[PDB]
């Protein structure tokens, strides 16, 4: 193996989720053993989503992960493990654009969909994060959103208090069940849309800014 | 600019294609959907591609076949067998044809793969093509469908006639037909 086969590039690696895997009809990969390839070429990698390198996502297929969005959203490419099997083996650079994975399972389209260049489809956006997760929610979709090029997050904490929400500076509300009613009530009188995290979810599958209502799991409180 | 040209241009010569009818049978090896101008097959199977003319082409004309693939994003992009089968006619060329004077190509500046055989008279002459890939073979086409471009061309390699078909090469063929057939019938 060359000692150089990687250099230049930097690395994201995920793992699909159980829920990922499970959704079947709707050697195995290995982060760390893929890893030690990656190095041995003097691959960088990176633990976490961040000009000097290429970077890369690797996984096993379409998942539902931090990285994956972050990636979807930053046009880092989503490249197939196997990319790495077949550049180790053959010991020279494949084309990784005949190994992307696919965007995700699309609600709209009702399969899974390829992956196409697209662009950053929330440019411009201004939006207002309400969850009373600081941050599997608050914290995590702030960033996505803002490197998939929005114009601006305001965060809010669902148990915290409205005493400087000027609701009507923004182009749409992203939050969830835990959303305090009073938001919800205003939202209406300011006709702002309010959806769920599945609505940003989709935007970044879909790779373009979709129906704010064109599905039902894009509303705010679509439990189970 | 590279994306070779993928132009219906029948020519002089009143180039056409056309295909053998089979089922939409769950045990069909390659089956032909008139509705969407695309051929379903089985990874290395008899492809029957018939050519049809008004006037006989002169001895010395030749047939090329050519993939691309369909969509824009993916074009330029050259197509080619996946690392794994290339591993088991050049191992790197994904259309074959049994039967001949078989000649494969590997255009030194396009980096094009294509195969040619001699233009024979018939009534049609039929051609037979094997995909050696599955159409979501990873690393390969990768679930990127593709156009197979054929080509009438002279002794010395001119445009006498051209056209086209879509392909997708998987397990089931008469399953796959009917389906994206279906799939056409409302969005
Ligand atoms: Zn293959």
Same mark, same amino acid.
């Given at each position: 193996?060359?000692?150089?086969?990687? %250099?230049?590039?930097?690395?994201?690696?995920?793992?699909?989720?159980?829920?990922?895997?499970?959704?079947?009809?709707? +050697? +195995?990969?290995?982060?760390?053993?893929?890893?030690?390839? %990656?190095?041995?070429?003097?691959?960088? @990698?990176?633990?976490?989503?961040?000009?000097?390198?290429?970077?890369?996502? @690797?996984?096993?297929?379409?998942?539902?992960?931090?990285?994956?969005?972050?990636? &979807?959203?930053?046009? =880092? +490419?989503?490249?197939?493990?196997?990319?790495?099997?077949?550049?180790?083996?053959?010991?020279?650079?494949?084309?990784?654009?005949?190994? &992307?994975?696919? *965007?995700?399972?699309? %609600?709209?389209? $009702?399969? =899974?969909?390829?992956?196409?260049?697209?662009?950053?489809?929330?440019?411009?956006?201004?939006?207002?994060?309400?969850?009373?997760?600081? $941050?599997?929610? %608050?914290?995590?979709?702030?960033? @996505?959103?803002?490197?998939?090029? *929005?114009?601006?997050?305001?965060?809010?904490?669902?148990?915290?208090?409205?005493?400087? =929400?000027?609701?009507?500076?923004?182009?749409?509300?992203?939050?969830?069940?835990?959303?305090?009613?009073?938001?919800?009530?205003? *939202?209406? *009188?300011? $006709?702002?849309?309010?959806?769920?995290?599945?609505?940003? @979810?989709?935007?970044? =599958?879909?790779?373009?800014?979709?129906?704010?209502?064109?599905?039902?799991?894009?509303?705010?409180?679509?439990?189970? | 600019?590279?994306?070779?040209?993928?132009?219906?241009?029948?020519?002089?010569?009143?180039?056409?294609?056309?295909?053998?009818?089979?089922?939409?049978?769950?045990?069909?090896?390659?089956?032909?959907?008139?509705?969407?101008?695309? !051929?379903?097959?089985?990874?290395?199977?008899?492809?029957?591609?018939?050519?049809?003319?008004?006037?006989?082409?002169?001895?010395?004309?030749?047939?090329?076949? !050519?993939?691309?693939?369909?969509?824009?994003?993916? !074009?330029?992009?050259?197509?080619?067998?996946?690392?794994?089968?290339?591993?088991?006619?050049?191992?790197?060329?994904?259309?074959?044809?049994?039967?001949?004077?078989? /000649?494969?190509?590997?255009?030194?500046?396009?980096?094009?793969?294509?195969?040619?055989?001699?233009?024979?008279?018939?009534?049609?002459?039929?051609?037979?093509?094997?995909?050696?890939?599955?159409?979501?073979?990873?690393?390969?086409?990768?679930?990127?469908?593709?156009?197979?471009?054929?080509?009438?061309?002279?002794?010395?390699?001119?445009?006498?006639?051209?056209?086209?078909?879509?392909?997708?090469?998987?397990?089931?063929?008469?399953?796959?037909?009917?389906? /994206? /057939?279906?799939?056409?019938?409302?969005?």
């Amino acid at each position: 193996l060359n000692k150089t086969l990687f %250099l230049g590039y930097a690395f994201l690696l995920t793992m699909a989720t159980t829920s990922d895997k499970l959704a079947s009809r709707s +050697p +195995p990969f290995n982060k760390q053993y893929t890893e030690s390839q %990656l190095r041995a070429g003097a691959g960088y @990698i990176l633990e976490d989503f961040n000009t000097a390198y290429q970077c890369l996502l @690797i996984a096993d297929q379409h998942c539902r992960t931090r990285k994956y969005f972050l990636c &979807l959203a930053s046009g =880092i +490419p989503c490249v197939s493990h196997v990319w790495v099997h077949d550049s180790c083996h053959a010991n020279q650079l494949q084309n990784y654009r005949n190994y &992307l994975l696919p *965007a995700g399972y699309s %609600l709209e389209e $009702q399969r =899974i969909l390829d992956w196409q260049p697209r662009e950053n489809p929330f440019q411009n956006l201004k939006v207002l994060l309400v969850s009373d997760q600081q $941050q599997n929610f %608050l914290e995590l979709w702030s960033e @996505i959103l803002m490197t998939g090029g *929005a114009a601006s997050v305001k965060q809010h904490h669902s148990s915290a208090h409205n005493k400087d =929400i000027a609701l009507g500076v923004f182009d749409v509300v992203v939050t969830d069940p835990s959303c305090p009613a009073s938001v919800l009530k205003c *939202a209406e *009188a300011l $006709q702002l849309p309010v959806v769920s995290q599945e609505w940003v @979810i989709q935007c970044l =599958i879909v790779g373009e800014r979709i129906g704010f209502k064109q599905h039902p799991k894009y509303k705010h409180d679509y439990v189970s | 600019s590279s994306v070779p040209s993928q132009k219906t241009y029948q020519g002089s010569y009143g180039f056409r294609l056309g295909f053998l009818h089979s089922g939409t049978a769950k045990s069909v090896t390659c089956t032909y959907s008139p509705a969407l101008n695309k !051929m379903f097959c089985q990874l290395a199977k008899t492809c029957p591609v018939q050519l049809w003319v008004d006037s006989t082409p002169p001895p010395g004309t030749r047939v090329r076949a !050519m993939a691309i693939y369909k969509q824009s994003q993916h !074009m330029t992009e050259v197509v080619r067998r996946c690392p794994h089968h290339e591993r088991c006619a050049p191992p790197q060329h994904l259309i074959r044809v049994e039967g001949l004077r078989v /000649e494969y190509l590997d255009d030194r500046n396009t980096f094009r793969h294509s195969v040619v055989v001699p233009y024979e008279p018939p009534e049609c002459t039929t051609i037979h093509y094997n995909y050696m890939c599955n159409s979501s073979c990873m690393g390969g086409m990768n679930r990127r469908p593709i156009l197979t471009i054929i080509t009438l061309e002279d002794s010395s390699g001119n445009l006498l006639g051209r056209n086209s078909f879509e392909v997708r090469v998987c397990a089931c063929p008469g399953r796959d037909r009917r389906t /994206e /057939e279906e799939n056409l019938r409302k969005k």
